[PDB]
Design a binder for this molecule. Structure first.
Ligand SMILES: Nc1nc2c(ncn2[C@@H]2O[C@H](COP(=O)(O)OP(=O)(O)NP(=O)(O)O)[C@@H](O)[C@H]2O)c(=O)[nH]1
Ligand SMILES: [Mg+2]
Lengths: 171, 144
């Protein structure tokens, strides 16, 4: 039914859009009502890359601080991690440094890391210039995309790119 | 959502209907195979052309049984997925009830109960993960 199982993980502050980003990828749908994630969840999406059927198990974490210890239990199994901030929320981007340290402490040493600046449809409420995301990604050697779950901008591209980078080192 | 509760129930009913269809089909195929296996043994008098036909029909019964059995196996996992997803949804809703109450109104027993529901909810996600891991172990085994 599939060739390979990849484990992905989404982390970042509460409200930045981790759950909507996943829902747009898994369902091609967007919902405006904020339902905060409680503890941990995951969804399954199977994709085809280079003739292989890749089952993605995508773990979605609670960004609320209360759930931090629950969420850190799930870093170590991840093969790729999306760090998500909100381009309209300056604090969400300042905390990316902290989320990177969490990956340093709890994830596997060779996990793939990808930075997502979400809500890129809110140009007129932007606080984080795209160049700051590009710069911190350059400083860590990681990929970076500005995304929008609402407008469906770079959602498929982000997830499929991360999956290709995992697949590229699979044998 | 609440949409998702209904869609989960309907999908579970649909799979149960198909599982019932497969159970009936497998027992009919089994009876047919027994009948043709008996004809091959009893009727060695019979021409090779007729016995070649029975051998061919036995081979295609075998192919259909394997296909039905593979479909049944995948649906049985989906049944349990939907059961776990429904249980997680129930715990999610119960915990949001506790969470939406002002902290000033919570007794010590309320806070203990909320913690317990959160522990159960995380465990349900871990049960769903264990099912994913079961499928990956069967994938590895079926491959070899
Ligand atoms: N304009 C806009 N709003 C978005 C976008 N993505 C999410 N939102 C909105 O932002 C809010 C929070 O989204 P959500 O996915 O729940 O964020 P989260 O990171 O999962 N929060 P948590 O960590 O608490 O579970 C919701 O109101 C949602 O509609 C986007 O691309 N554009
Ligand atoms: Mg969420």
């Amino acid at each position: 039914t599939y060739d390979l199982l990849f484990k992905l993980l989404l982390i970042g502050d509460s409200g930045v859009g981790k759950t909507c980003v996943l829902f747009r990828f898994s369902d091609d749908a967007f919902n405006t009502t904020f339902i905060s994630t409680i503890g941990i969840d995951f969804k399954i999406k199977t994709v085809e890359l280079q003739g292989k059927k890749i089952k993605l198990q995508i773990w979605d974490t609670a960004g609320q601080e209360r759930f931090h210890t629950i969420t850190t239990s799930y870093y170590r199994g991840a093969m790729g991690i999306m760090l998500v901030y909100d381009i309209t929320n300056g604090k969400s981007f300042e905390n990316i440094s902290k989320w990177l340290r969490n990956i340093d402490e709890h994830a596997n040493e060779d996990v793939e890391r990808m930075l997502l600046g979400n809500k890129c449809d809110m140009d007129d409420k932007r606080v984080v210039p795209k160049g700051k995301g590009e710069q911190i990604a350059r400083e860590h050697g990681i990929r970076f995309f500005e995304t929008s779950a609402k407008a469906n901008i770079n959602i498929e591209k982000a997830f499929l790119t991360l999956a290709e980078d995992i697949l590229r080192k699979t044998p | 959502m609440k949409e998702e509760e209904m869609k989960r129930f309907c999908k579970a009913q649909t799979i149960q209907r198909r599982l019932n269809e497969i159970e009936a089909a497998l027992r009919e195929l089994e009876a047919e195979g027994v009948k043709l296996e008996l004809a091959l043994r009893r009727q060695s008098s019979s021409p090779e052309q007729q016995k070649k036909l029975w051998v061919g029909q036995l081979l295609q019964l075998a192919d259909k049984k394997n296909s039905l059995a593979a479909e049944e196996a995948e649906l049985m996992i989906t049944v349990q997925e939907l059961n776990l997803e429904e249980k997680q949804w129930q715990l999610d809703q119960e915990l949001r009830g506790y969470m939406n109450r002002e902290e000033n109104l919570k007794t010590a027993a309320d806070r203990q109960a909320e913690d317990q529901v959160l522990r159960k909810l995380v465990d349900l996600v871990n049960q769903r993960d264990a099912l994913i891991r079961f499928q990956e172990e069967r994938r590895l085994s079926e491959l070899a």
